[PDB]
């Protein structure tokens, strides 16, 4: 359970993302793919991309980055009351895309990394704490759905 002040921190951070959703989404996906190349293999859409330059030049990668972070922003603005929004993503990611929960942990770390990189000296220690809690909540609630469907624990 995040506090109100922690939710406020999270959504203040998210306001930085919303000023350039495509830019953040692209930087997150590239950080993920390059830090954890197994992740790229899950995207039949993107696995042709070999180099960071090709990733950066991919307009379609940007487009998908918008789709993904738009969904995450909507979830965060629910301040934990996200059952309806989280259900479809759980089902797709477990059963269709076949994304292990561990990869969602890597995704969370890529988000944090990119926030520091884009906003140096402006992503406060309080805000990092709050964002961690928000993301941990999202992974806990997705993981329960995966467990239900026979995918994790
Ligand atoms: C915070 C984490 C994430 C969010 C909010 C998110 C959100 C979304 C959304 C909204 C879609 C399109 C709708 C859908 O198919 O359900 C999608 C598709 C997809 N996601 Fe994610 N996702 C996340 C994490 C991941 C991770 C970590 C991976 C892989 C390592 C992944 C792989 C995919 C794939 C393969 C698709 C299908 C893309 C296509 O071929 O068009 N997602 N995601
Ligand atoms: O992308 N995690 O440092």
Domain tally for the chain? 1
Q: Say which ligand is closest to the CA of 107.
A: 1
Q: Say which ligand is closest to the CA of 108.
A: 1
Sequence-separated contacts (24+) of 118-122 with Cβ below 8 Å: 118/16, 118/23, 118/24, 118/27, 119/16, 122/16
Alpha-carbon dihedral sign for residues 114, 103, 142, 91? positive
- Residue 2 CB: number of other CB atoms within 10 A? 17
Find the CATH number of the domain harbouring 64. Answer: 1.10.490.10
147 to each of 52, 68, 90, how far by Cα in Å? 34, 22, 10
Return the residue matching tokens 């997150």: 28
Indicate the burial class of 60 (C-beta count within 10 angstroms; 0-12, 13-18, 19 or more).
exposed
The 3-state DSSP class for residue 130 equals helix
| Spatial distance between the Cα atoms of 137 and 76, rounded to a whole number of angstroms | 10
The secondary structure of the chain in percent helix, strand, coil, rounded to multiples of 5, reads 75, 0, 25
Token output for 103: 């990869």
Which residue from 134, 109, 120 is spatially nearest to 10, judged by alpha carbons? Answer: 134
Side-chain half-sphere exposure of 48, counting CA atoms within 13 A? 8
Token output for 64: 């998908």
Which residue from 148, 108, 99 is spatially nearest to 128, judged by alpha carbons? Answer: 108
The 3-state DSSP class for residue 148 equals helix
User: Could you tell me the distance, in angstroms and rounded to a whole number, from the CA of residue 26 to the centre of ligand 2?
Assistant: 14
Ligand 1 atom closest to the Cα of residue 135 is: 1
Decide: 31 in ligand 2 pocket, CB within 6 A: yes
What technique determined this structure? X-ray
Domain extent, residue 20, equals 1-153
- Residue 104 CB: number of other CB atoms within 10 A? 19
Return the residue matching tokens 């996200």: 82
User: Could you tell me the distance, in angstroms and rounded to a whole number, from the CA of residue 103 to the centre of ligand 1?
Assistant: 11
| Spatial distance between the Cα atoms of 6 and 10, rounded to a whole number of angstroms | 6
Secondary structure (DSSP) of 10-78:
HHHHHHHHHTTHHHHHHHHHHHHHHH-HHHHHT-TTTTT--SHHHHHH-HHHHHHHHHHHHHHHHHHTT
Is residue 64 a known part of a binding site?
yes
Ligand 1 atom closest to the Cα of residue 72 is: 5
The 3-state DSSP class for residue 116 equals helix
């Amino acid at each position: 359970v995040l506090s109100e002040g922690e939710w406020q921190l999270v959504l203040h951070v998210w306001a930085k993302v919303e000023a350039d959703v495509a830019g953040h989404g692209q930087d997150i996906l590239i950080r993920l793919f390059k830090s954890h190349p197994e992740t790229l293999e899950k995207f039949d859409r993107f696995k042709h991309l070999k180099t960071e330059a090709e990733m950066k030049a991919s307009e379609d990668l940007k487009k998908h980055g918008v789709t993904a972070l738009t969904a995450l922003g909507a979830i965060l603005k629910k301040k934990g009351h996200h059952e309806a929004e989280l259900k479809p993503l759980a089902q797709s990611h477990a059963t269709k895309h076949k994304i292990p929960i561990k990869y969602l942990e890597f995704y969370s770390e890529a988000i944090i990394h990119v926030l520091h990189s884009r906003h140096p000296g402006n992503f406060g220690a309080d805000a990092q704490g709050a964002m961690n809690k928000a993301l941990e909540l999202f992974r806990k609630d997705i993981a329960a759905k995966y467990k239900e469907l026979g995918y994790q624990g």
